Curated annotation (Swiss-Prot), chains B, F:
Attaches the virion to the cell membrane by interacting with host receptor, initiating the infection. The major receptor is host ACE2. When S2/S2' has been cleaved, binding to the receptor triggers direct fusion at the cell membrane. When S2/S2' has not been cleaved, binding to the receptor results in internalization of the virus by endocytosis using host TFRC and GRM2 and leading to fusion of the virion membrane with the host endosomal membrane. Alternatively, may use NRP1/NRP2 and integrin as entry receptors. It comes from Severe acute respiratory syndrome coronavirus 2 (2019-nCoV). The chain holds residues 341 to 389 of 1273 of the full protein. Changing L28I: In strain: Omicron/XBB.1.5, Omicron/EG.5.1. Glycans are attached at N3. Changing R6T: In strain: Omicron/BQ.1.1, Omicron/XBB.1.5, Omicron/EG.5.1. Changing S35F: In strain: Omicron/BA.1, Omicron/BA.2, Omicron/BA.2.12.1, Omicron/BA.2.75, Omicron/BA.4, Omicron/BA.5, Omicron/BQ.1.1, Omicron/XBB.1.5, Omicron/EG.5.1. This is Spike protein S1. Binds to host ACE2. RBD also interacts with the N-linked glycan on 'Asn-90' of ACE2. Cleavage of S generates a polybasic C-terminal sequence on S1 that binds to host Neuropilin-1 (NRP1) and Neuropilin-2 (NRP2) receptors. Interacts with host integrin alpha-5/beta-1 (ITGA5:ITGB1) and with ACE2 in complex with integrin alpha-5/beta-1 (ITGA5:ITGB1). May interact via cytoplasmic c-terminus with M protein. May interact (via N-terminus) with host bilirubin and biliverdin, thereby preventing antibody binding to the SARS-CoV-2 spike NTD via an allosteric mechanism.
From Swiss-Prot, chain C:
It comes from the Viruses. The gene is S. Binds to host ACE2. RBD also interacts with the N-linked glycan on 'Asn-90' of ACE2. Cleavage of S generates a polybasic C-terminal sequence on S1 that binds to host Neuropilin-1 (NRP1) and Neuropilin-2 (NRP2) receptors. Interacts with host integrin alpha-5/beta-1 (ITGA5:ITGB1) and with ACE2 in complex with integrin alpha-5/beta-1 (ITGA5:ITGB1). May interact via cytoplasmic c-terminus with M protein. May interact (via N-terminus) with host bilirubin and biliverdin, thereby preventing antibody binding to the SARS-CoV-2 spike NTD via an allosteric mechanism. It comes from Severe acute respiratory syndrome coronavirus 2 (2019-nCoV). This is Spike protein S1. Attaches the virion to the cell membrane by interacting with host receptor, initiating the infection. The major receptor is host ACE2. When S2/S2' has been cleaved, binding to the receptor triggers direct fusion at the cell membrane. When S2/S2' has not been cleaved, binding to the receptor results in internalization of the virus by endocytosis using host TFRC and GRM2 and leading to fusion of the virion membrane with the host endosomal membrane. Alternatively, may use NRP1/NRP2 and integrin as entry receptors. The chain holds residues 390 to 437 of 1273 of the full protein.
Swiss-Prot record, chain D:
The chain holds residues 972 to 1019 of 1273 of the full protein. Subunit of the fusion protein that is processed upon entry into the host cell. Mediates fusion of the virion and cellular membranes by functioning as a class I viral fusion protein. Contains a viral fusion peptide that is unmasked after S2 cleavage. This cleavage can occur at the cell membrane by host TMPRSS2 or during endocytosis by host CSTL. In either case, this triggers an extensive and irreversible conformational change that leads to fusion of the viral envelope with the cellular cytoplasmic membrane, releasing viral genomic RNA into the host cell cytoplasm. Changing S11A: In strain: Alpha/B.1.1.7. This is Spike protein S2'. It comes from the Viruses. It comes from Severe acute respiratory syndrome coronavirus 2.
Length: 97, 49, 48, 48, 48, 49
């Protein structure tokens, strides 16, 4: 999506997460900014030695190479053939006999 | 879902719910704009069926 | 090796659609266009 | 395989993404017959 | 709550009992399923 | 390496090889002596394992 999302300074509004107590479960969301404790030390406040902000951004710029460039993603997830259907593809029904 | 002006950030990945509607997945599958379209429990051709 | 009957099929396409040449596919080249037989024995050679 | 129901494989996958599943069902099912027919032969000796 | 779907099942039966939970058997029907996606750690009721 | 008396000029940067030994980072990533440590294809936490 480089021509849609990229900017020659870096579109810094996109954040990923670098740290986590544990690998999150399938389809889990985690809204947090609480500082990651890389040292054995406890670490309060906004920053600290070996105390890392748990997010970092992408700098998205058109001047980068392929692979660096921003990708949009959609994951279409669905469940099938086991419950009352609420979505269908464009097949018309026939009569019933 | 595919032309919306800003997407969300991954750490706060948006979820939209879909129901009570008709789904022409040939729209998604045919467009060259998409680099990858990998399906993990259906063939992409079968989505319309 | 040796080969019974050998046929070279030649054409030009957009590179995005090279993947449609794979033996069982369904983009417009593979559809209305040049369709491989599913048990296709042979090679595909492509270049920019 | 993705299911026990053969039609829920066939009505979801194409002719070749299905094979990788259907061959599993053919394999396991056929071993289920070979096991039954072995037990029935060994049993047929007890009754004989 | 399963994978973001909160589900309610319920039953109402008549009874005639003075104090404890009535010994016997019956099953709850599924009443509703809602896509709520929230975390639920804990809960409370609502009197009137 | 980190504690060397003298370091090289970057125009002639030293390229030293390391082997036959154990890579213990505990007196390293966990240590006050550096105002930056960034890894680029591993988690620094994993450098022991
Ligand atoms: C939801 O968060 C609460 C409070 O932190 C926690 O006790 C519970 O384990 C969490 N459950 C899930 C699945 O996130
Ligand atoms: C360097 O070595 C000294 C001991 O010779 C040690 O006290 C110090 O922590 C070391 N520093 C680093 C950055 O490894």
């Amino acid at each position: 999506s480089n021509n849609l999302d990229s900017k020659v300074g870096g579109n810094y509004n996109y954040l990923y997460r670098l740290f986590r107590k544990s690998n999150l479960k399938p389809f889990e969301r985690d809204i947090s900014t609480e500082i990651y404790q890389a040292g054995s030390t406890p670490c309060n406040g906004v920053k600290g030695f070996n105390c890392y902000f748990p997010l970092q951004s992408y700098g998205f710029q058109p001047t980068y190479g392929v692979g660096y460039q921003p990708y949009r993603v959609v994951v279409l997830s669905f469940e099938l053939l086991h419950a009352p259907a609420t979505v269908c593809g464009p097949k018309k029904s026939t009569n019933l006999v | 879902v595919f032309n919306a002006t800003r997407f969300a950030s991954v750490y706060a990945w948006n979820r939209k719910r879909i129901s009570n509607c008709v789904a022409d997945y040939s729209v998604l599958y045919n467009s060259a704009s998409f680099s990858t379209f990998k399906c993990y429990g259906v063939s992409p051709t079968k989505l319309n069926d | 090796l040796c080969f019974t009957n050998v046929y070279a099929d030649s054409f030009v396409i957009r590179g995005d659609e090279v993947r449609q040449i794979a033996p069982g596919q369904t983009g417009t080249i593979a559809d209305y266009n040049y369709k491989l037989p599913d048990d296709f024995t042979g090679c595909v050679i492509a270049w920019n | 395989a993705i299911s026990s129901v053969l039609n829920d494989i066939l009505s979801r996958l194409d002719k070749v993404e299905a094979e990788v599943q259907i061959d599993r069902l053919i394999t396991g099912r056929l071993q289920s017959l070979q096991t039954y027919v072995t037990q029935q032969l060994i049993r047929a000796a007890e009754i004989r | 709550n399963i994978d973001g779907y909160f589900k309610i099942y319920s039953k109402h039966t008549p009874i005639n009992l003075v104090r404890d939970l009535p010994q016997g058997f019956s099953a709850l029907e599924p009443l509703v399923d809602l896509p709520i996606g929230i975390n639920i750690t804990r809960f409370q009721t609502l009197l009137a």
